[PDB]
């Protein structure tokens, strides 16, 4: 499950003079009860190293944007699923959170994590905007979270009129480094992003972080907090 890391998180806060780091419990985060219960059901106990700094920023009042770098098994996914689930209102039957995955097979993987952690949200439903979904033109998605690969997601927001992107509250880009390396994905994501509202929360996660990826991250996450955790 969690990968070990002696190292420390480096944190560039969006606001230099507004220190607000480090939660050492989930109970501190003032999650909705059904979200904390979700967490509990998953067996989590303490936030992970990356989560300890990442969650207070993402779940700030109001939420803040983030570029985060940490290796596999640090808890990135868990952290952003919490992020999306805490903004979602199931009452409202239309997409509010939008997660981009570099592949089909991860779009589903992350989906499962969303479904498991959102277990106690009544009527929470997920759409998968990925290769080979069945949807006919004319339809409009009533699922409150959408996960998928950038091209199909872009179609749903534009061409096909499936999602109104002006209504999304949280946008996640998982695995930036892999994303960019895939044909089409960078431009696709930029195109999605640009049509999200100003107040949308943007979050971006990568394992690696070379200059291509950093410069991409800057186009996509305005006014970011940046977090790095050196690999071990």
């Amino acid at each position: 499950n969690l990968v070990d890391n002696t190292n420390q998180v480096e944190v560039l806060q969006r606001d230099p003079n507004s220190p607000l780091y480090s939660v050492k419990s989930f109970e501190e985060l003032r999650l909705k009860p059904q979200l904390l219960q979700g967490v509990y059901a998953m067996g989590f106990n303490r936030p992970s190293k990356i989560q300890e700094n990442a969650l207070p920023l993402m779940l700030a009042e109001p939420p803040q944007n983030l570029i985060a770098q940490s290796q596999s098994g640090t808890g990135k996914t868990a952290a952003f699923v919490l992020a999306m689930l805490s903004q979602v209102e199931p009452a409202n039957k239309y997409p509010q959170c939008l997660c981009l995955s570099p592949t089909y097979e991860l779009a589903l993987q992350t989906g499962k994590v969303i479904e498991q952690m959102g277990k106690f949200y009544p009527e929470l439903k997920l759409a998968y905007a990925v290769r080979g979904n069945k949807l006919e033109r004319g339809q409009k998605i009533s699922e409150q979270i959408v996960i998928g690969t950038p091209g199909t997601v872009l179609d749903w927001c534009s061409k096909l009129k499936f999602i109104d992107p002006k209504k999304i509250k949280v946008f996640v880009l998982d695995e930036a480094d892999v994303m960019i390396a895939t044909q089409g994905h960078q431009d696709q994501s930029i195109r999605i992003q640009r049509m999200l509202p100003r107040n949308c929360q943007m979050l971006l996660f990568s394992a690696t972080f070379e200059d291509s990826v950093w410069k991409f991250a800057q186009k996509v996450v305005p006014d970011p907090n940046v977090i790095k955790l050196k690999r071990e």
């Binding site: 290769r131 061409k159 895939t182 044909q183 994905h185």
Partner: protein, 421 residues
């Protein structure tokens, strides 16, 4: 409604993007066509506001290596710059690949077509590459070439359509002969030769497509499709004559509005031995339009062996495909996977780049390096020139069953027979 189909046996595979011209200050708005390709000799011709550039095609094609940023633009590549006194809005090549036409607008003098003998580009003993003949369209603003097409089988013959609605058929040998013309009141908006090159089809402001012998004697009228009302009147924007009784026809708002979006319509025609009406199928906006600032223009081409049509549009960042069905009569959109599409990039200032020119190379001899370990045979390469001055090449991999390789080895250009100024 619109027929569509997930195609997993076709992918566009991006090669590195290559900068040709420097990024412009403003978005280029006017109808233009700035890429030509010699598939006989392996040359590409690119034009802009800023000269004409000729490359050996293989120099423009560079494959991504694992490790490389597939979004990094190569800065330049060796080719030849031919200075031009005025900006170019249209480039085209004759069917023998020996005559390049370059259309220019001068604010002072109006429009002129320059004709280059393609050997002159190869003539090391000419430091300056001059055209051998001009053709001056007395016209100034209404003299913009808006469509111009060489005959697919008569090398000396070219069809030219201007903004004012007039049209002309030219014969270009060692000099320029006007063979046929039709005045502006005919209202031509677009033009396209029959496959064998025996007739000319012209799109028109009134929404019809008229067929003509090269002498411009009228042969057949295709009426404006019945589904368009009188209070939503349209004009042919572009036309592609695919088979004798088969056409792709693009309609746009008669009045010039950019806001409405064009309809790509497939049309099947009856025969003399039929009294059926014309069958039209509206596929509508297969190249999704993100831009309402540019003059509409669909870049259409048919690839017989694959029985499909490639489509690009001045208002869209995406290339679309319309294939004939196993059926052999009807057409369908191909819906391709996210990482196998052909899209122009976002400019570094975060705007969309759009197409100014579109061609396909069939002289590529390099094999596609897939994994470390896997390699596929050479494929044709789609090439787009963007509004940002970047060239965008994509291999077209058609893995559908029974499709025969379209690759054709190129020849050396001999200076023999070069025409002089």
């Amino acid at each position: 409604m619109i027929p569509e189909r997930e195609m997993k046996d076709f992918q566009f595979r991006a090669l590195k993007k290559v900068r040709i011209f420097d990024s412009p200050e403003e978005l280029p708005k006017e109808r233009s066509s700035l890429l030509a390709v010699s598939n006989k000799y392996g040359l590409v011709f690119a034009g802009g506001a800023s000269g004409l550039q000729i490359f050996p095609t293989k120099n423009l094609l560079i494959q991504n290596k694992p490790g490389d940023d597939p979004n990094k633009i190569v800065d330049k590549v060796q080719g030849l710059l031919v200075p031009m006194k005025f900006p170019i809005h249209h480039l085209a090549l004759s069917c023998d690949n020996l005559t390049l036409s370059a259309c220019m607008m001068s604010s002072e003098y109006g429009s002129i077509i320059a004709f280059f003998d393609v050997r002159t580009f190869s003539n090391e003993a000419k430091q300056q590459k001059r055209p051998f003949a001009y053709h001056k369209l007395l016209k100034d603003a209404g003299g913009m070439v808006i469509d111009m097409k060489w005959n697919p089988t008569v090398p000396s013959m070219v069809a030219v359509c201007l903004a004012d609605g007039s049209i002309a058929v030219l014969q270009v040998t060692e000099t320029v002969k006007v063979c046929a013309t039709l005045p502006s009141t005919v209202a031509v908006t677009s033009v396209c030769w029959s496959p064998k090159g025996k007739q000319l089809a012209v799109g028109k402001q009134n929404g019809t497509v008229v067929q003509y012998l090269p002498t411009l004697q009228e042969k057949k009228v295709i009426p404006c499709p019945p589904f368009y009302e009188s209070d939503h009147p349209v004009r042919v924007l572009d036309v592609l004559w695919i088979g004798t009784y088969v056409f792709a026809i693009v309609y746009a708002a008669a009045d010039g509005t950019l806001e409405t979006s064009p309809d790509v319509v497939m049309a099947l025609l009856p025969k003399k031995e039929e009294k059926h009406p014309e069958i039209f199928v509206n596929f509508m906006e297969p190249c999704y339009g993100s831009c309402t600032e540019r003059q509409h223009h669909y870049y259409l081409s048919y690839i017989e062996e694959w029985d499909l049509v490639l489509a690009a549009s001045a208002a869209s960042t995406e290339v679309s495909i319309l294939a004939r069905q196993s059926d052999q009569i009807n057409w369908e959109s191909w819906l391709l996977e996210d990482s196998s599409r052909a899209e122009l990039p976002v400019t570094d200032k975060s705007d969309d780049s759009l197409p100014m020119g579109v061609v396909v190379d069939y002289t590529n001899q390099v094999e596609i390096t897939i994994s470390d370990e896997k390699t596929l045979p050479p494929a044709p390469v789609l090439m787009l020139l963007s509004t940002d001055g970047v060239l965008c090449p994509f291999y077209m991999i058609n893995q559908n069953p029974g499709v025969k390789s379209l690759i054709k080895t190129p020849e050396r250009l001999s200076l023999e027979g070069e025409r002089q100024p």
